[PDB]
Design an enzyme around this catalytic site. Structure first.
Site, PDB file in Angstrom:
ATOM      1  N   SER A   1       9.255  25.241  59.748  1.00 15.88           N
ATOM      2  CA  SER A   1      10.335  26.243  59.664  1.00 15.88           C
ATOM      3  C   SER A   1      11.713  25.720  59.275  1.00 15.88           C
ATOM      4  O   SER A   1      12.569  26.538  58.921  1.00 15.88           O
ATOM      5  CB  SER A   1      10.420  27.077  60.936  1.00 15.88           C
TER       6      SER A   1
HETATM    7  C1  LIG Z   1       8.249  26.673  62.233  1.00 16.25           C
HETATM    8  O1  LIG Z   1       8.354  25.491  62.460  1.00 16.25           O
HETATM    9  C2  LIG Z   1       6.939  27.387  62.477  1.00 16.25           C
HETATM   10  C3  LIG Z   1       7.059  28.511  63.511  1.00 16.25           C
HETATM   11  O2  LIG Z   1       7.322  27.955  64.795  1.00 16.25           O
HETATM   12  N1  LIG Z   1       8.615  27.420  65.000  1.00 16.25           N
HETATM   13  C4  LIG Z   1       9.172  27.316  66.158  1.00 16.25           C
HETATM   14  C5  LIG Z   1       8.510  27.780  67.440  1.00 16.25           C
HETATM   15  C6  LIG Z   1       9.466  28.649  68.271  1.00 16.25           C
HETATM   16  C7  LIG Z   1       9.205  30.122  68.061  1.00 16.25           C
HETATM   17  O3  LIG Z   1       9.548  30.659  67.017  1.00 16.25           O
HETATM   18  O4  LIG Z   1       8.651  30.778  68.932  1.00 16.25           O
HETATM   19  C8  LIG Z   1      10.509  26.719  66.163  1.00 16.25           C
HETATM   20  O5  LIG Z   1      11.344  27.179  65.402  1.00 16.25           O
HETATM   21  O6  LIG Z   1      10.766  25.776  66.904  1.00 16.25           O
HETATM   22  N2  LIG Z   1       5.857  26.404  62.674  1.00 16.25           N
HETATM   23  C9  LIG Z   1       4.537  26.650  62.513  1.00 16.25           C
HETATM   24  O7  LIG Z   1       4.121  27.762  62.235  1.00 16.25           O
HETATM   25  C10 LIG Z   1       3.596  25.501  62.661  1.00 16.25           C
HETATM   26  N3  LIG Z   1       2.752  25.396  63.653  1.00 16.25           N
HETATM   27  O8  LIG Z   1       2.565  26.372  64.661  1.00 16.25           O
HETATM   28  C11 LIG Z   1       1.206  26.880  64.682  1.00 16.25           C
HETATM   29  C12 LIG Z   1       0.743  27.484  63.351  1.00 16.25           C
HETATM   30  C13 LIG Z   1       0.405  26.658  62.305  1.00 16.25           C
HETATM   31  C14 LIG Z   1       0.015  27.191  61.042  1.00 16.25           C
HETATM   32  O9  LIG Z   1      -0.259  26.435  60.116  1.00 16.25           O
HETATM   33  C15 LIG Z   1      -0.017  28.615  60.889  1.00 16.25           C
HETATM   34  O10 LIG Z   1      -0.357  29.210  59.704  1.00 16.25           O
HETATM   35  C16 LIG Z   1       0.297  29.390  61.966  1.00 16.25           C
HETATM   36  N4  LIG Z   1       0.637  28.848  63.184  1.00 16.25           N
HETATM   37  O11 LIG Z   1       0.847  29.743  64.275  1.00 16.25           O
HETATM   38  C17 LIG Z   1       3.556  24.451  61.603  1.00 16.25           C
HETATM   39  C18 LIG Z   1       4.065  24.669  60.369  1.00 16.25           C
HETATM   40  S1  LIG Z   1       3.718  23.273  59.360  1.00 16.25           S
HETATM   41  C19 LIG Z   1       2.847  22.525  60.687  1.00 16.25           C
HETATM   42  N5  LIG Z   1       2.228  21.289  60.615  1.00 16.25           N
HETATM   43  N6  LIG Z   1       2.863  23.313  61.718  1.00 16.25           N
END
Ligand SMILES: *C(=O)[C@H](CO/N=C(\CCC(=O)O)C(=O)O)NC(=O)/C(=N\OCc1cc(=O)c(O)cn1O)c1csc(N)n1
Length: 499
Positions: A242
């Site tokens: 993100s």
């Molecule tokens: C951004 O980094 C995203 C969304 O989560 N970000 C958060 C969590 C807090 C919140 O919003 O509640 C933040 O800003 O700190 N990251 C991801 O989506 C990733 N992993 O989470 C699980 C996931 C993975 C995935 O590939 C997908 O399609 C859906 N989910 O739920 C992530 C992104 S790249 C990576 N290696 N992981």
């Protein structure tokens, strides 16, 4: 060998303020002419003891090398220890003036400064990257050996040992100390495996701090495992998640099809792209404006915008800000990462690119990218050395789009439901958190401050927090607040959050 090379005095490494970081300290190497040592056998036990060595093993060594005219007894001792062996008056024993490195700040700047080997040659970090500038050139002195190797006279001192040149780093030792302590403390409190923290000057491209946990004492390099020696901020590659959405948003705002008040429907927090499903981490939203997409980190939201604008405009921004691109720093083991490109971008790749999946970057690339956004969309080339004349820089994002993205990022930190833990006392701060799933996680926070006229960009990467909470905003955001507060104060940046 009728000529010997006098080791050159290796150039001083200082921080941006002249605080010493790598100092060449005089040491003494002891060598011997076995043909002369073989005439003073009764003296060997006194000598064996003086250099540490076992009496019989030392004798076996001299008996084996009996025909040679030179051998090293012991390299780089303390000058007084060298003096103590020379004072024994053992025939065939001679000294050499040598240099060894001392690292005053030690573990605080280990990864950045690096270290030199046995031969005083750069092996890691700045020591290696700037070895030619630092080393200088040894000098040749003519010697007169009768036949047996006995030095009679120094005939001609032709070439003099040209000392290495001084090098001032971009690193501010005060900021480095602050970054190192706060990252160490965060790792303890979160039960984290590793961590990285990068501080940039947005206007100059200067790396003001670069800290990794775990660190090592470069002065006591023995026993060391490469896990503590890894310069993670430049070597460790990860999916930025993100934290890259502000860049996807910059392409959105530059397209002419999007404005911050625009609404996207992200319900039910999932989006099917045939075989693949885009999934939001929190799935309790329907309509979100563009700032809301960033606050709630909606992968669905940004993927929908990405489908509308095209992955080409997103790829371009990311590539122009340096993600997955060569930093030109030339540091040992520096990983470039990966920004995938396509002729025809499939729907699934478009989405994953928009929300930071698939692409891999370094902490240093992410900080540089945020620096371009903080510097009114202008990217300045990265520097590990003090910048006196600022390079022209490239307008990568329009000043207006960058200013809008800044305001949105300020709202990500300030607004209801935002990353309140990133908030900096007396300043408006802007930033974006990230949580990359590796079931292990990498906690990320990227940002800049003052949100009004940005001066400093910061990236906090916390590797594997073993406490119940792992989100970037819970873990890396309080580190950003503390380090950003200290850095703004140290650089005497005027507060922008007053009545
Ligand atoms: C951004 O980094 C995203 C969304 O989560 N970000 C958060 C969590 C807090 C919140 O919003 O509640 C933040 O800003 O700190 N990251 C991801 O989506 C990733 N992993 O989470 C699980 C996931 C993975 C995935 O590939 C997908 O399609 C859906 N989910 O739920 C992530 C992104 S790249 C990576 N290696 N992981």
């Amino acid at each position: 060998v009728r000529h010997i090379a006098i080791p050159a005095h290796r150039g001083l490494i200082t921080d941006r303020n002249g605080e010493p970081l790598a100092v060449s300290t005089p040491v003494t190497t002891l060598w011997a002419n076995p043909k002369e040592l073989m005439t003073a056998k009764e003296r060997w036990p006194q000598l064996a003891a003086a250099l540490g060595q076992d009496t019989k093993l030392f004798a076996d060594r001299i008996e084996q090398n009996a025909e040679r005219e030179f051998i090293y007894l012991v390299r780089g001792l303390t000058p007084e220890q060298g003096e103590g062996v020379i004072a024994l008056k053992v025939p065939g024993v001679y000294s050499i003036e040598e240099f060894r490195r001392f690292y005053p700040a030690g573990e605080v700047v280990a990864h950045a400064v690096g270290f030199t080997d046995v031969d005083d040659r750069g092996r890691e970090g700045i020591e290696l990257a700037f070895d030619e500038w630092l080393a200088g050139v040894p000098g040749k002195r003519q010697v007169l050996k009768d036949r047996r190797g006995r030095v009679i006279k120094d005939v001609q001192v032709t070439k003099n040992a040209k000392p290495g040149k001084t090098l001032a780093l971009s690193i501010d030792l005060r900021l480095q100390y602050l970054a190192h302590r706060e990252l160490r403390n965060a790792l303890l409190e979160n039960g984290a495996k590793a961590g990285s923290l990068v501080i940039m000057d947005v206007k100059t491209g200067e790396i003001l701090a670069m800290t990794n946990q775990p660190t090592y004492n470069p002065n006591n390099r023995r026993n060391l495992q490469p896990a503590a020696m890894r310069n993670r901020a430049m070597i460790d590659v990860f999916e930025p998640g993100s934290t890259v959405k502000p860049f996807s948003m910059s392409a959105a705002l530059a397209s002419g099809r999007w404005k911050p008040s625009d609404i996207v429907d992200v319900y039910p927090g999932t989006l099917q792209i045939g075989r693949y499903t885009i999934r939001d981490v929190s799935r309790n939203s329907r309509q979100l404006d563009l700032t809301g997409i960033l606050i709630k980190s909606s992968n669905v939201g940004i993927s929908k915008i990405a489908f509308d604008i095209g992955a080409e405009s997103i790829y371009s921004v990311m590539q122009q800000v340096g993600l997955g691109q060569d930093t030109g720093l030339g540091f040992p083991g520096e990983r470039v990462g990966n920004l995938p490109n396509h002729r025809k971008w499939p729907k699934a790749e478009t989405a994953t690119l928009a929300y930071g999946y698939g692409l891999s970057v370094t902490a240093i690339q992410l900080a540089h990218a945020y620096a371009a956004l903080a510097n009114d969309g202008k990217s300045v080339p990265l520097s590990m050395t003090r910048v006196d004349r600022v390079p022209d820089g490239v307008q990568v994002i329009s000043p207006e789009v960058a200013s809008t993205v800044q305001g949105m990022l300020q709202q990500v930190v300030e607004a209801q439901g935002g990353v309140f833990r990133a908030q900096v006392p007396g300043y408006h701060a802007a930033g974006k958190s990230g949580t990359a799933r590796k079931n292990a996680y990498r906690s990320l926070f990227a940002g800049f401050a003052p949100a009004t006229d940005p001066r400093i960009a910061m990236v906090v990467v916390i590797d594997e927090p073993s406490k119940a909470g792992y989100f970037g905003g819970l873990v890396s955001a309080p580190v950003f607040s503390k380090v950003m507060a200290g850095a703004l104060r140290l650089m005497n940046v005027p507060p922008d959050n007053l009545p």
